[PDB]
């Protein structure tokens, strides 16, 4: 009947969004996923999945449109990714990847009449085959979120269509999970919101997204800054360059996934 703790809700509206709303929303989202300090070569690490108790596990994110229809996205605090959403009176969850998440997800919107888990998961790789379009060709900006939100909401009432429902999670994930993971991808999105542009991510956005767990291991294993071996990254035009060091990435990456552990901390 009622229940084992409420999760933080952070709000954003695309209604009169500016570079300010957007920034203020992503720093509130960065702030609720990291409990301040497991800070490793200046970059924060997000909570380990192992003794993290269900009531500390998610964050809820309300997204509302000009024309007052809203969606509630659930983010997993341990890797900042979208696990599912609620619109109306029904809730949709992506297909979990394991038994422990299958059951953290039963805690999530337990007060909704109707609850469905997709046969499919939320990784970009399955979701691009559903949308019919690679991330490289799907446009980002404020207009794409206004639209993403109406589409995740009419999926409830049956206004449906999978190509379009998977199109809109690709956009909600990058405009939120990914702008929060990287200071770089939040600047790409506010450049689109300042100037009223909608555009697809270029190749520096896409490799950064694909590399967020490789950079996280690389940085946790660094011999106090130096990467055990170089990571190849990409420029907006497609070129490949390597990073040998954490330095150059402190302005670029905001949050890291936990891959391994300290012994003292030296950070006080």
Curated annotation (Swiss-Prot):
What chemistry does it catalyse, as a reaction equation?
Answer: Endohydrolysis of the N-glycosidic bond at one specific adenosine on the 28S rRNA
Say how it is used: A deglycosylated form may be linked to monoclonal antibodies to produce immunotoxins exploited in cancer treatment. However, a point mutation should be introduced to eliminate vascular leak syndrome, a side effect resulting from endothelial damage.
The name of this protein is Ricin A chain
Record: residues binding AMP: 81-82, 122-124
Q: Which domain of life is it from?
A: Eukaryota
**Where in the sequence does glycosylation occur per the annotation?**
11, 237
Q: Which residues of the full protein are shown?
A: 36 to 302 of 576
Q: What role is this protein assigned?
A: Acts as a glycosidase that removes a specific adenine residue from an exposed loop of the 28S rRNA (A4324 in mammals), leading to rRNA breakage. As this loop is involved in elongation factor binding, modified ribosomes are catalytically inactive and unable to support protein synthesis. Can inactivate a few thousand ribosomes per minute, faster than the cell can make new ones. Therefore a single molecule can kill an animal cell.
Q: What phylogenetic lineage does the species belong to? A: Eukaryota, Viridiplantae, Streptophyta, Embryophyta, Tracheophyta
The positions flagged as active site in the entry are 81, 124, 178, 181
Source organism per entry reads: Ricinus communis (Castor bean)
Describe what happens upon changing residue 98 to A: No effect on the toxic activity but Suppresses the vascular leak syndrome
Q: Name the consequence of residue 75 to A/M.
A: No effect on the toxic activity or the vascular leak syndrome
Coiled coil spans: none
Q: Which residues hold a carbohydrate?
A: 9-11, 16, 51, 142-147, 196-198
């Amino acid at each position: 009947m009622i229940f084992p703790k409420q999760y933080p809700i952070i709000n954003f509206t695309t209604a009169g969004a500016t570079v300010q709303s957007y920034t203020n929303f992503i720093r509130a989202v960065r702030g609720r996923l990291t409990t301040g300090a497991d800070v490793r070569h200046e970059i924060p690490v997000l909570p380990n999945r192992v003794g993290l108790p269900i009531n500390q596990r998610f964050i809820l994110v309300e997204l509302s449109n000009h024309a007052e229809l809203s969606v509630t996205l659930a983010l997993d605090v341990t890797n900042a990714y979208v696990v599912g959403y609620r619109a109306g009176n029904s809730a949709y969850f992506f297909h979990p990847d394991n038994q422990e998440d299958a059951e953290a997800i039963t805690h999530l919107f337990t007060d909704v009449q109707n609850r469905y888990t997709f046969a499919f998961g939320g990784n970009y790789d399955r979701l691009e085959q559903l949308a019919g379009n690679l991330r490289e060709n799907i446009e980002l900006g404020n207009g794409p979120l206004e639209e993403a939100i109406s589409a995740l909401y009419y999926y409830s009432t049956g206004g449906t269509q999978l190509p379009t429902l998977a199109r809109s999670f690709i956009i909600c994930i990058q405009m939120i999970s990914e702008a929060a993971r990287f200071q770089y991808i939040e600047g790409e999105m506010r450049t689109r919101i300042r100037y009223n542009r909608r555009s697809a991510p270029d190749p520096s956005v896409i490799t950064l997204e694909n590399s967020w767990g490789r950079l996280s291991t690389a940085i946790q294993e660094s011999n106090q800054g130096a990467f055990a071996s170089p990571i190849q990254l990409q420029r907006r035009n497609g070129s490949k360059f390597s990073v040998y060091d954490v330095s150059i990435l402190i302005p670029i990456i905001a949050l890291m996934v936990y891959r391994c552990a300290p012994p003292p901390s030296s950070q006080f």
